[PDB]
Amino acid sequence: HMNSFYSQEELKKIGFLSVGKNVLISKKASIYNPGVISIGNNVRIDDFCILSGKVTIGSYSHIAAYTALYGGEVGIEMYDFANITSRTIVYAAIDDFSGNALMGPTIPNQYKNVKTGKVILKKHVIIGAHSIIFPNVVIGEGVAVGAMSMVKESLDDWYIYVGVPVRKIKARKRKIVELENEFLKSM
Amino acid sequence: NLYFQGHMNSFYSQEELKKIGFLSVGKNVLISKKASIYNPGVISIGNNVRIDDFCILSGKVTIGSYSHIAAYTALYGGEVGIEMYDFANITSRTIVYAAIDDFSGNALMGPTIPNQYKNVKTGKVILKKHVIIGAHSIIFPNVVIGEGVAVGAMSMVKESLDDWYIYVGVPVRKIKARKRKIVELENEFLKSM
Amino acid sequence: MNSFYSQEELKKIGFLSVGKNVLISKKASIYNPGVISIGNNVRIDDFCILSGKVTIGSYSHIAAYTALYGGEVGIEMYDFANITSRTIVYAAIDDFSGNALMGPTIPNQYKNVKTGKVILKKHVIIGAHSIIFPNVVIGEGVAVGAMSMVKESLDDWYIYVGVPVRKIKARKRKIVELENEFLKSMNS
Ligand SMILES: CC(C)(COP(=O)(O)OP(=O)(O)OC[C@H]1O[C@@H](n2cnc3c(N)ncnc32)[C@H](O)[C@@H]1OP(=O)(O)O)[C@@H](O)C(=O)NCCC(=O)NCCS
Ligand SMILES: CC(C)(COP(=O)(O)OP(=O)(O)OC[C@H]1O[C@@H](n2cnc3c(N)ncnc32)[C@H](O)[C@@H]1OP(=O)(O)O)[C@@H](O)C(=O)NCCC(=O)NCCS
Ligand SMILES: CC(C)(COP(=O)(O)OP(=O)(O)OC[C@H]1O[C@@H](n2cnc3c(N)ncnc32)[C@H](O)[C@@H]1OP(=O)(O)O)[C@@H](O)C(=O)NCCC(=O)NCCS
Ligand SMILES: Cc1cn([C@H]2C[C@H](O)[C@@H](COP(=O)(O)OP(=O)(O)O)O2)c(=O)[nH]c1=O
Ligand SMILES: Cc1cn([C@H]2C[C@H](O)[C@@H](COP(=O)(O)OP(=O)(O)O)O2)c(=O)[nH]c1=O
Ligand SMILES: Cc1cn([C@H]2C[C@H](O)[C@@H](COP(=O)(O)OP(=O)(O)O)O2)c(=O)[nH]c1=O
Ligand SMILES: [Cl-]
């Protein structure tokens, strides 16, 4: 009733590819194939998140509650100061919706048409709540995507995007870069 | 170590499945221990089914065979029921309701209020063969989703949908026909068993 | 059958206050119950998160997956308010503009958190998969539809839909007549 996080002790026992310092992971999150999951320093991952398969997170990042990172074999990577708000999904693989293929994990590979590609969230990216990020996209440096937004293509740096599928609505301010430097100085 | 630490998968053993009390459960059935199943005596499931973490199945729910019910998905079947036919699949974080309250302001609402004061709209939800429901979608009561229909991510379905079309939006609109190459694939895949 | 805590388990949780016929999932998360007040006849379902200052009245259903982050300012729901599944209510959020660093991994002085009490008045219903931002008063009798986003207070007795929401029709007031009927039948 205070917090649900693993102790540093139990964290070491999960078997992550790598795990940094001050990492707070919820016991109510699911972690599958931790040997291909790498986490930097100062990371928080909240209840009912799912990390599955190849996932790489840097430093100063919050993965809020209910968020699913399906990294598959090609991987999802987040850079430093990226953050994901609650209930987001990031897929590195998805089934073909068109009608040209059978679908999903109960069906063999030879009948499906899985679309796959590494997803990267560059530095300072923020993903708004209830959003969905499709495979093989780079979310540009300093990009913000609004709540309930859907991204199927890579996003140009330093813009704010909204909607389903997203469209660009205004520049993201770049004062956070100064703040990053100021913050890192003080440390 | 990994398997027993809970970091390979979360599914019940087949021994455990039997102890849950499903009306009917098939072979090769993988259900997360982190899903919630309420009133398993009215729930039945065919063969080759996977139901992921944090799903909820409550009340009358019938799933056939070769179906994935992805993580966070809730199926509230109540007394009227939700049925999915074979090769139907539902992506993450979908909700299907066989009953909802009246939003108009003409009735009181939800499970803390007695029924005489409510005006619950109920009706069976059927997803026919090869239906795919994209992530973060909502299906409302008394809806038939026709054979081969695809609903896009973040879509809301309040009416029955025509077979073999793709629909998107809130509420959904028809955008293009679904291809039917899958009808061949099904035949070819079953023909090698 | 059901996942609710017993009366005995509820009292071990430590709520600032908790009423009778309160049905709370064991698979929900409650953080800082010390600042959480709940009235009578309340149901909170699987995979809910209530964290920080949250006050709920009576005759309210918080459906599954719903997160209420009250932080320090608080979230408050008045009687007969209800929240359908997978809603988020935030009493604080980060500045998205690019003028401020973001989130719990960063000290306050580099961030620009907007904070303010969120209030849902009597007979409010929030449709599934919706988001309510800080410092919003949802007026008495408001319905917001599924997949709504609400960034600003909403006028009483209207139905709103969309992202961000727009007012589409009046909500009917018969529900107040039913409220008084129901309450009357329960006192005599
Ligand atoms: C994206 C966002 C930052 C934009 O807010 P803003 O800069 O104040 O912009 P506005 O509210 O003026 O909207 C500008 C345009 O975008 C639309 N819009 C804003 N947010 C949108 C969204 N999430 N989806 C679709 N459209 C949206 C507005 O309707 C407006 O459209 P118009 O020009 O056609 O009128 C904000 O709406 C948002 O989505 N924040 C998400 C917060 C969150 O998820 N937080 C959780 C973690 S701390
Ligand atoms: C529905 C879907 C298949 C359509 O993709 P597509 O056939 O490539 O079509 P496009 O991307 O060209 O979109 C066609 C139109 O529909 C709109 N659209 C596409 N997807 C939409 C959605 N999910 N919601 C609302 N509108 C959508 C597009 O904006 C475009 O509109 P326009 O005609 O006004 O320009 C795809 O966008 C989608 O939603 N896939 C869901 C995948 C998923 O949820 N997967 C889970 C894991 S396996
Ligand atoms: C909001 C709601 C009550 C409106 O239903 P309705 O009064 O029957 O109205 P309609 O279906 O005619 O829609 C009116 C307009 O709103 C739009 N609309 C309806 N619901 C919408 C929604 N959730 N988001 C965005 N637009 C919506 C319609 O497209 C229509 O637009 P138009 O006039 O431009 O054609 C209903 O659509 C809804 O969202 N219900 C949510 C139920 C739920 O969440 N339940 C779970 C717990 S019991
Ligand atoms: C959301 C969440 C919170 N908590 C605990 C740890 C947090 O320090 C505390 C408050 O979190 P939260 O309510 O998100 O507030 P803040 O944004 O101010 O950190 O509750 C968890 O343990 N797991 C969770 O999933
Ligand atoms: C999503 C999820 C995965 N898993 C485990 C078992 C899966 O075989 C493994 C990977 O699943 P997933 O990451 O969905 O990959 P794929 O689409 O390739 O099957 O993770 C669970 O146990 N429960 C879950 O809810
Ligand atoms: C959704 C849910 C149901 N249940 C149990 C108790 C409920 O009475 C039962 C059926 O609930 P539900 O399917 O929500 O139906 P209704 O609206 O008719 O109450 O399942 C839980 O214990 N926790 C849950 O989160
Ligand atoms: Cl969710």
Chains that touch B (3 or more CB pairs under 8 A): A, C
Residues 6+ apart with CB under 8 A from B118: B101, B102, B107, B108, B109, B110
Task: Indicate the SS3 state at residue B108.
Answer: coil
Examine residue B45 and state whether it is found in any structural domain, yes or no: yes
Q: What is the spatial distance between Cα A72 and Cα A32, in angstroms, rounded to a whole number? A: 10
Examine residue A25 and state whether it is found in any structural domain, yes or no: yes
Task: Characterize B100-122 residue by residue with b for buried, 16 or more Cβ atoms within 10 angstroms of its Cβ, and e for exposed.
Answer: bbbbebebbbbebbeeeebeeee
Distances (CA, A) of A84 to A112, A145, B13, C45: 30, 10, 34, 24
Residue with tokens 């005006």: B119
Examine residue C185 and state whether it is found in any structural domain, yes or no: no
Residue C150 tokens read as 């609400």
Determine how many CB atoms are found less than 10 A away from the CB of residue C39: 20
Residue B4 tokens read as 């027993």
Contacts of A33 in chain B (CB under 8 A): 7-8
| Residues with C-beta atoms within 5 A of ion ligand 7 | A 66, 87; B 72, 93; C 65
Query: What ligand is nearest to the CA atom of residue C31?
Result: 4
Count: domains in chain B: 1
Do residues A49 and A68 touch, judged by C-beta distance below 8 A?
A: yes
Residue A184 tokens read as 């890192």
> Ligand 1 atom 14: the closest Cα is on which residue?
A169
Q: What is the spatial distance between Cα A39 and Cα A31, in angstroms, rounded to a whole number? A: 12
Beta-strand relationship, B29-31 and C143-144: unpaired
Residue A135 tokens read as 């495979």
Determine how many CB atoms are found less than 10 A away from the CB of residue C180: 9
Residue B106: CATH number of its domain:
2.160.10.10
Could you give phi then psi for residue B11, rounded to 5 degrees?
A: -85, 150
Q: Which atom of ligand 3 is nearest to the CA of C127?
A: 44
Residue A150 tokens read as 């859907």
Examine residue A179 and state whether it is found in any structural domain, yes or no: no
Number of H helices, E strands in chain C: 2, 20
Residue with tokens 């209530």: C50
Residues 6+ apart with CB under 8 A from C111: C94, C95, C100, C101, C102, C103
Q: Which domain holds residue A108?
A: 1-172
Residues 6+ apart with CB under 8 A from C176: C123, C141
Task: Characterize B67-79 residue by residue with b for buried, 16 or more Cβ atoms within 10 angstroms of its Cβ, and e for exposed.
Answer: bbbbbbbbbbbbe
How far is CA C8 from its chain centroid? Answer: 25
Determine how many CB atoms are found less than 10 A away from the CB of residue A181: 10
Do residues A69 and A87 touch, judged by C-beta distance below 8 A?
A: no
Q: What is the spatial distance between Cα C47 and Cα B161, in angstroms, rounded to a whole number? A: 31
Q: What is the spatial distance between Cα A146 and Cα A91, in angstroms, rounded to a whole number? A: 18
Method of determination used here: X-ray
Residue with tokens 């709520």: C15
Examine residue B187 and state whether it is found in any structural domain, yes or no: no
Q: What is the spatial distance between Cα B159 and Cα A184, in angstroms, rounded to a whole number? A: 54
> Ligand 6 atom 21: the closest Cα is on which residue?
C2
Contacts of C122 in chain B (CB under 8 A): none
Examine residue C182 and state whether it is found in any structural domain, yes or no: no
Examine residue C37 and state whether it is found in any structural domain, yes or no: yes
- A130 CA from centroid of ligand 7 (Å): 8
Instruction: Output the DSSP codes for C58-93.
Output: SSEEE-TT-EEEEEEEEEEE-TT-EE-TT-EEESEE
Q: What is the spatial distance between Cα B20 and Cα B67, in angstroms, rounded to a whole number? A: 20
Q: What is the spatial distance between Cα A170 and Cα B104, in angstroms, rounded to a whole number? A: 37
How far is CA B182 from its chain centroid? Answer: 20
User: Do residue B95 and residue C80 have CB atoms under 8 angstroms apart?
Assistant: no
Examine residue A64 and state whether it is found in any structural domain, yes or no: yes
Does residue B171 have a cis peptide bond before it, meaning omega lies within 30 degrees of 0?
A: yes
Q: What is the spatial distance between Cα A85 and Cα A130, in angstroms, rounded to a whole number? A: 8
